[PDB]
Ligand SMILES: Cc1c(C(=O)C2=C(O)CCCC2=O)ccc2c1n(Cc1ccccc1[N+](=O)[O-])c(=O)n2C
Ligand SMILES: Cc1c(C(=O)C2=C(O)CCCC2=O)ccc2c1n(Cc1ccccc1[N+](=O)[O-])c(=O)n2C
Ligand SMILES: [Co+2]
């Protein structure tokens with residue numbers, strides 16, 4: 001069931017913004033590790049005396065990395081005279097965020113028809129305001145409401161990246177590409193799922209999309225904006241990884257970003273080649289009992305050779321009634337065991353491909369455990 | 378002249394420690410960009426609940442990257458019970474440093490015969506204490522005194538990296554190597570050169586080793602520990618880059634690290650290949666008038682082919698009465714126009730090679746300017 005109850009018109013994920021201590025080093029690491037092109041900037045060299053912001057793109061996926069400069073550089077500025085290209089930016093908020101949580105996501109940005117309307121309707125429906133709608137260069141409108149923890153849901157709307165960003169000159173813009181194409185879903189960890197769901201569904205109208213954690217997925221009308229949320233389950237034998245996150249992150253925040261690849265085998269080969277030379281490490285592969293049991297469950301979908309590819313790369317496979325999901329998880333992106341990335345590819349539900357096709361892999365919790373035991377034998 | 382007036386016995390540069398917001402991302406970026414191997418760690422996985430520290434090595438060069446975890450992870454600890462592997466580490470000091478200066482060098486570490494003696498003699502001779510000598514695992518002694526700004530001179534002595542660091546398992550330790558072998562000199566920017574010199578020479582006994590800036594070099598008895606210091610010169614037509622540094626860094630700090638390569642041509646080819654794909658950008662090359670005028674000044678030392686190599690790579694050349702210096706400068710290492718790296722190779726003064734052979738390139742200030750004008754023509 002899909003009541004299509006969005007309170008305003010939502011398009012697609014637009015970008016994810018990381019709040020960093022040094023945006024340069026994080027952006028260069030991510031660029032190399034994920035195969036994303038350096039495509040736009042806003043920093044001292046473009047007249048921004050407030051923050052350094054670097055945009056990486058791969059397909060439709062936009063990763064923005066932002067850090068504050070010395071406040072002394074902009075001490076004479078006021079909000080009407082600011083040289084910041086993102087008017088919601090605040091030195092104190094950014095420094096507090098990063099010292100409290102370490103590296104992680106500040107903003108999940110979705111494009112909407114009308115960001116002013118999206119904000120007012122959201123706030124009228126319980127959203128906690130974070131940054132009021134501001135029209136940039138009479139061309140783009142930006143507004144922010146609290147999502148969970150210190151993460152904000154950012155609305156962006158275009159009359160026709162952002163004003164005051166410059167496109168990067170081609171000599172500095174190496175066209176890296178490992179096959180990642182768009183953001184599939186963005187997942188938050190909170191201490192209590194119930195109140196988090198009620199708040200977010202309450203101001204968006206997003207509907208509930210149909211071990212250590214309880215989880216639920218909120219989705220927009222066409223189910224292309226997918227926002228899962230997790231809570232811990234206490235009292236279990238192994239400690240909840242959601243609780244571990246909350247402890248190391250100092251509370252609620254973004255847990256993982258799932259990135260859709262147009263060729264997850266190519267993506268994972270390219271990423272794994274680079275893990276030890278500046279890129280991203282992947283979680284421990286599951287035992288071969290998992291791949292032995294794969295013929296049975298997805299021999300329908302994947303050939304023996306394509307299943308061989310999965311075992312080499314550590315790809316996990318899940319399947320619901322509609323489609324098939326291939327997935328794998330990176331180790332944490334930074335110092336703390338908090339935010340990680342998921343690489344994703346979905347098979348099925350062709351109409352374009354409908355959103356969430358194949359689910360989110362929760363079948364892989366049981367299959368993994370079972371596979372571990374059958375491997376011990 | 379070399380009065381050999383060290384007040385304690387100094388060996389070699391031991392390591393440079395960066396204070397970061399996220400040590401993981403900086404270390405992975407530097408590893409890839411400089412060709413340094415990931416060789417040791419101290420973090421959650423080794424029982425350190427206080428800070429994450431990752432060591433990169435290339436030859437004798439040791440770069441350490443450190444960031445604080447959430448203080449809540451170690452809130453029950455006291456200094457006698459600390460799980461920090463570097464006992465001088467302090468959450469508040471590190472967060473203050475990084476939010477004030479951004480990414481940069483906290484510690485210039487030199488190995489000494491006796492770090493307890495080095496500290497006491499230093500403090501008896503005017504050094505401002507920063508961290509008292511602490512003996513780690515009855516094997517290594519560590520102590521710190523203020524150098525300039527919030528940079529400390531760290532003394533390390535070994536009875537026979539540090540206790541509580543683990544060597545990295547080989548699957549995670551890719552043997553990158555672009556030819557960098559050791560730290561040649563480490564340079565500070567201060568507002569006033571005179572008082573800075575008097576302080577540091579005063580507690581070390583280091584002797585003065587024989588445009589926008591005034592500069593002087595302090596050196597140990599065998600002139601292998603080289604600590605140049607710069608001050609700005611105000612009133613010039615172009616603004617002093619030393620003053621720019623002081624403004625963006627919020628005061629005195631480390632300006633550049635000069636890294637000796639056993640093959641600067643190989644190093645720069647390897648680094649330049651990686652600039653746009655996660656590595657380091659280099660400063661704008663000087664005009665061809667510089668390379669045309671190179672035969673005349675160093676045709677003695679470098680063949681036409683080796684001079685061709687210099688023009689391709691942007692290498693600068695200087696020469697004093699004793700030796701020849703090849704050098705090139707990176708763009709800033711992070712968001713702020715503050716700290717950068719210099720790649721270095723020295724030709725001459727064979728005995729081993731005596732320290733500082735060829736000087737530090739100050740002849741290249743005039744040669745560069747001249748070369749610019751002769752290029753305009
Ligand atoms: C997070 C996750 C997903 C997943 O993507 C997801 C959603 O997108 C919304 C629905 C709830 C959900 O779990 C799917 C399968 C999983 C899994 N995890 C946990 C995990 C794995 C690697 C690193 C950290 C963590 N961790 O700390 O939880 C796991 O073991 N299996 C088998
Ligand atoms: C720092 C420097 C050195 C140098 O290494 C050095 C020492 O090791 C101790 C003696 C004083 C000294 O200058 C040598 C030649 C130089 C130079 N600079 C400035 C520079 C260059 C690139 C990026 C930033 C800056 N900058 O901001 O100054 C320059 O133009 N030329 C020709
Ligand atoms: Co997921």
Ligand SMILES: [Co+2]
Nearest residue numbers: 564635719737
């Ligand atoms: Co130098």
